[PDB]
Design a protein around this ligand. Structure first.
Ligand SMILES: Nc1ncnc2c1ncn2[C@@H]1O[C@@H]2COP(=O)(O)O[C@H]3[C@@H](O)[C@H](n4cnc5c(N)ncnc54)O[C@@H]3COP(=O)(O)O[C@H]2[C@H]1O
Ligand SMILES: Nc1ncnc2c1ncn2[C@@H]1O[C@@H]2COP(=O)(O)O[C@H]3[C@@H](O)[C@H](n4cnc5c(N)ncnc54)O[C@@H]3COP(=O)(O)O[C@H]2[C@H]1O
Ligand SMILES: Nc1ncnc2c1ncn2[C@@H]1O[C@@H]2COP(=O)(O)O[C@H]3[C@@H](O)[C@H](n4cnc5c(N)ncnc54)O[C@@H]3COP(=O)(O)O[C@H]2[C@H]1O
Lengths: 92, 92, 92, 92, 92, 92
């Protein structure tokens, strides 16, 4: 109960701040859907390329799954930074 | 004309790849709007806090504009990483 | 009141989870003190180097204040990532 | 012997600079201990959740081990940036 | 054909801009070669250390392959940021 | 004298390791030159665009100097990560 008063640096948030944070998180959910769609595209591309040595090698060299994971991480940490800008903890 | 054939590692993109890239960029435009709204909130909060020494000091210590800039950069580079996952350049 | 139930993805935390999060934040406070000490060192070094053109140029070329700001940002975002590992939001 | 004179951009460090660098590295060791404790917590949580399909799925969706690895990397690179602010190499 | 006119924010590039972008990408290829050489060094070091428990443990604790992967990612995203500085998209 | 024996986690480096580190740093110097050339291009572009309101606004919106600074930071930290992969400190 009222666990935020127990966590260092956290403060009481207004309804406006909570609403802005939730807007960030909902836009993030949309990005999650998009990233899942891209991952499905990559799976289908790899499948359609089976036993095409040159195209499989091209895909492997491009490393698209690693780049998608990098992008997902960046989107999530950007979300966290914006939410911190809104919520403004009282601590380092 | 056909400048992509002149840039190292770039390749001919299908309509599906272009569409996915544009989906990423349009979601990014939505994030740009959200970030502008948060920046307006920060400006209004700072203005309403003028000549309240303690609250101005709290805002300054929280560094919300710096955190918003960090978040914007992360969102943009995440977008670029996802677009790279889609477009798959042929070079390092 | 009970604002965490209003924020997307947040959940009820056990006392153990709150304690671990606060441990992260207290270690972060120690890092804040260290970073302040380094900044004081940089200020004193620059002051003691006044009207020594070569040493002022060396300091300017090394960009130590920019590197200290990069380090501070990395420590803070690492803290946030560890706290996310502990608290485990239910959302993207 | 005196290998720093062989590495581009490195310089002779004062005792004060070495002491500050070691302070950064010792605080980092404390963070290493904390991260190990969090990893042990995650292992125990996963073990206690065996054959609870919903809770295992929740943990998997939260990706806590990946977030702990991200946090560890950020702490380490922040340390390196602060140490660079102290030591100030003479090169890009 | 002329696919850049179909992608949001992209613009017509001058020959000078294309040349600068390709300079970035060629320097990046040189970094790719260097990273491959370091990876070969790591493989040879690990091989020469087989059945030397202490040295294998030292290598494992240092995590050199993970640090090489972090460095590769940073070089690639730095390249992308410089290329963005040159090409200057019209969108977020 | 022999300052590396005083810094936590540092070790004695072979000539081969020092050579690889210096190769990384020299490639980095080449990147420094390239980044300076891009910055000169940006200055000249801005100058040639004086009193062209639309083009000045386009440049300002693209934020090319900020993207060049992001790229420089990424290249430098990637260098540091590769050098860490080579040198392999004994500490966190
Ligand atoms: N046809 C293609 N084939 C293969 N891969 C492709 C491709 N088009 C794009 N990519 C990949 O997508 C990456 C990210 O593109 P983004 O548009 O997000 O980020 C781009 C964009 O902001 C900018 N840029 C590139 N071309 C541009 C143009 N014609 N006009 C304006 N900005 C441009 O430069 C940024 C970095 O470009 P970079 O090449 O380093 O990184 C590119 C490249 O790896
Ligand atoms: N009431 C408040 N007052 C002041 N500042 C506030 C605040 N609530 C959040 N913040 C700030 O927002 C940052 C990012 O929150 P986010 O939810 O994106 O990222 C959060 C979230 O993913 C997770 N988290 C925190 N509490 C949680 C909970 N109850 N349930 C689940 N996950 C939680 O931990 C992440 C990192 O938290 P961290 O504290 O390091 O970083 C927080 C903190 O600096
Ligand atoms: N004597 C000196 N003069 C001027 N600047 C100095 C310096 N000693 C260190 N620095 C600066 O500090 C940066 C970070 O050092 P750190 O020990 O955190 O991170 C180091 C450390 O993990 C590793 N490393 C360097 N020398 C090592 C050694 N002898 N043994 C083990 N690891 C070593 O390589 C990492 C990256 O090194 P990098 O040179 O790229 O980046 C170095 C360099 O810019």
């Amino acid at each position: 109960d009222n666990q935020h008063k127990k966590i260092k640096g956290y403060r009481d948030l207004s309804q406006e701040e909570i609403d802005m944070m939730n807007r960030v998180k909902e836009l993030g959910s949309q990005f999650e859907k998009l990233i899942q769609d891209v991952s499905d595209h990559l799976r289908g591309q790899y499948n359609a390329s089976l036993h095409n040595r040159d195209e499989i090698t091209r895909i492997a060299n491009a490393e698209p799954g690693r780049w998608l994971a990098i992008g997902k991480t960046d989107i999530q940490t950007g979300m966290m930074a914006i939410i911190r800008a809104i919520a403004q903890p009282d601590s380092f």
